[PDB]
Symmetry: C3
Subunit: 212 residues, 3 copies
């Protein structure tokens, strides 16, 4: 049984799409495989495309995943942990702006600790990216939702920034923020990536994906 | 195979399928049917039987086409009146209607029960009370009406509602909702012939997104 | 087991979508069925819809197929060969312009040969269609890509018209050309069908599909 989207590609599945893979415990998970980008074989765990799905959600909803296979989704923190748990996988963030310019950022390794240990981002070196590095900042940080104050801020970033992320004090990227659609008067609260288009530009497309 | 598998989108949710998407369920006669589950809205577990999203599919269709279903799992579809009957025949599924306008305003309507009868009763709508909903109630008017299409007029109008309003629905004389009407993209001059919900955006506004869905 | 999209239709699958069929040799293949158009039961091997996928690809990429089940794709020349080898598939070509006007072309028989014959086009008579006939000109020609020029031009048709096709000298259709979005000054390098909207109009939607 295929472990990853990479295995599916090696088995001759050349079209991107939803396929079932088997996580280490042999639980089946239907995941979105990107078989085109950068050699293919990526498992996509976040996708924003059109603002049809609310990403301003609570801890339990980020834990189990939400959205739709027909568009936007977060795969879920438990699933992302299970996917990235033993061994390691490249993280790749793909971004597409309103003018259709591609930026990306690729980290050597990526995982998140299980719910007992919050979803602490354990993340390797930045390898390369036109987006620049905007995650290492958040390394060794719990994930935080509006109703879960694991952030070290005097107040609540998730509420301040209308999303969820490994918030510290507070964020340099915010890809699960509001779908504001370009540049946006308010501060730090869209699909932002600081080193990319900054704290006042919300991307059109966001995808976070993993590969062995 | 049938006896092990899910019988509704609600069972799939309870088994840990948290993403909306197409999954195969087993009807009461054990027929497998691939249906769209909404796991994301109002607690999830809804089986979606109508979906409009971009006007790519013609909804101005005949009786036999509505009977069997048409459209695409990629986008827009009507699941089919025989399937909707089989999904709702045995007890109590509630109905949710989700509508999005071109300005990203989300409105909905929720009904306590919804059942459509078989082909022999012309898919008669059996509709429970309006629970709540920011779209207002534009379906109680249509309670106990036959389903009608352009080529089969079962309405209470002396004419042809399906033709007049370029749709297929449980028309009375004629309508207050028309979610299988034409994809007119927002404001239209033509009367009552779009994806309309009277109490919502009125007879001259065709929604961007329409979804009709059911749950136990 | 279903052998074609037509068998699926006859078994009561009335919604278009991706289903797995069994090729002549019993290899499973997940294919897009069009269950609506012209009686339904078509297996779609090419789809353009929005320009999200690059069709300017090499020989090996066209051989194995590329793109996405959520959108645009080429099914792959080996698969198209395997689908069309055993007998008589009709071909239907569906085109939509930017004013949502539909045109089509239908051919009696269509097959492509194997890799050794360079996926040669074997095309039966034109039956009808509002787009007119812009494929018979290409009868009995090898498929060409940028990196494998099997065309009748002193140069490279695939490069000159940014596509992949059964080019002669050079073309009257170019449905794997660039997604130029309606009328374009540039000559013959879009999703073009000469008898349809001409050498300077690139369709919004193109689909190529087959049925027994
Ligand atoms: C559904 O509507 C029925 C009438 O509509 C028709 O039947 C549909 C299923 C559909 O085929 C439609 O297009 C048809 O036109 C209602 O039936 C009527 O119900 C009436 C009572 O509400 C009944 O009346 C009577 O009232 C008293 C009873 O003591 C008598 O004095 C009188 O003689 C009548 O008997 C009427 O006769 C009946 N009509 C018909 C043609 O059957 C039906 O009740 C309604 N159902 C619900 C749940 O509202
Ligand atoms: C096709 O072209 C070949 C050479 O490429 C030639 O031998 C042949 O006669 C043609 N065949 C048919 C059936 O038209
Ligand atoms: C992936 N690529 C850069 C190495 C080879 C080219 O493939 P294609 O993109 O030309 O079809
Ligand atoms: Ca705090
Ligand atoms: Ca009438
Ligand atoms: Ca070469
Ligand atoms: Ca040449």
């Amino acid at each position: 049984g295929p472990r990853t989207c990479k295995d599916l590609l090696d088995r001759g599945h050349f079209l991107s799409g939803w396929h079932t893979i088997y996580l280490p415990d042999c639980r089946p998970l239907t995941v979105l495989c990107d078989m085109d980008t950068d050699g293919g074989g990526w498992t996509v765990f976040q996708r924003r495309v059109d603002g049809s799905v609310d990403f301003y959600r609570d801890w339990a909803t980020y834990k189990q995943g939400f959205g739709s296979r027909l568009g936007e989704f977060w795969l879920g923190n438990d699933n992302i942990h299970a996917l990235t748990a033993q061994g390691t996988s490249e993280l790749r963030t793909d971004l597409v702006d309103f003018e259709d310019n591609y930026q990306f950022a690729k980290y050597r390794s990526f995982k998140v600790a299980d719910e007992a240990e919050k979803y602490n981002l354990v993340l390797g070196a930045f390898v390369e990216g036109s987006a620049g590095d905007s995650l290492t900042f958040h390394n060794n940080q719990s994930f935080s939702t509006k109703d879960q104050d694991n952030d070290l801020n005097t107040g609540n970033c998730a509420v301040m920034f209308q999303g969820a992320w490994w918030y510290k004090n507070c964020h340099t990227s915010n890809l699960n923020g509001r779908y504001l659609r370009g540049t946006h008067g308010s501060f730090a609260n869209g699909i932002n990536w600081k080193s990319g288009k900054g704290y006042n530009y919300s991307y059109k497309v966001s995808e976070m994906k993993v590969r062995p």
